[PDB]
Amino acid sequence: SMSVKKPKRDDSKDLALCSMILTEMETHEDAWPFLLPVNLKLVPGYKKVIKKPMDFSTIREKLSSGQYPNLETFALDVRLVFDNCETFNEDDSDIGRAGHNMRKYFEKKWTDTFK
Ligand SMILES: Oc1ccc2c(c1)N[C@H](O)CC2
């Protein structure tokens, strides 16, 4: 509260660390469904069903232009990619499995890096 400050983690390297994690996700062999925004004009249902589209190239642009105020807002966008994937794809599909794999991959990096 006012004039009562909690000690806080050193956040000075967060930008660099999130960038490294994003690079690792961009180069994962199962990243192909998530590299670019889904084409809302060509993919039936996607625009109406998925209220907040997100993809790695959009996350990269936001990270490169100071649009994440902290590391948690970055993690929210990453998770959103995988949440959107689950909404739109059966678990037993190539893209469905890709999303599950990439989520698992991300969360271990996240834990190992910041926890
Ligand atoms: O067969 C298809 C064709 C296009 C897409 C998907 C499956 N799922 C992705 O989540 C997004 C776009």
Curated annotation (Swiss-Prot):
Q: In which tissues is it expressed?
A: Expressed at varying levels in several tissues, whereas a smaller transcript was expressed specifically in testis.
Q: Tell me the ranges covered by the Bromo domain, including all copies.
A: 9-113
The cellular location(s) given in this protein's UniProt record come to: Nucleus
Family of this protein: Belongs to the WAL family.
Question: What does this chain do?
Answer: Regulatory subunit of the ATP-dependent BRF-1 and BRF-5 ISWI chromatin remodeling complexes, which form ordered nucleosome arrays on chromatin and facilitate access to DNA during DNA-templated processes such as DNA replication, transcription, and repair. Both complexes regulate the spacing of nucleosomes along the chromatin and have the ability to slide mononucleosomes to the center of a DNA template. The BRF-1 ISWI chromatin remodeling complex has a lower ATP hydrolysis rate than the BRF-5 ISWI chromatin remodeling complex.
How it assembles, according to the record, is: Component of the BRF-1 ISWI chromatin remodeling complex, at least composed of SMARCA1 and BAZ2B, which regulates the spacing of histone octamers on the DNA template to facilitate access to DNA. Within the BRF-1 ISWI chromatin remodeling complex interacts with SMARCA1; the interaction is direct. Component of the BRF-5 ISWI chromatin remodeling complex, at least composed of SMARCA5/SNF2H and BAZ2B, which regulates the spacing of histone octamers on the DNA template to facilitate access to DNA.
From the Swiss-Prot or TrEMBL record, give the protein name: Bromodomain adjacent to zinc finger domain protein 2B
The portion of the full protein included here is 2054 to 2166 of 2168
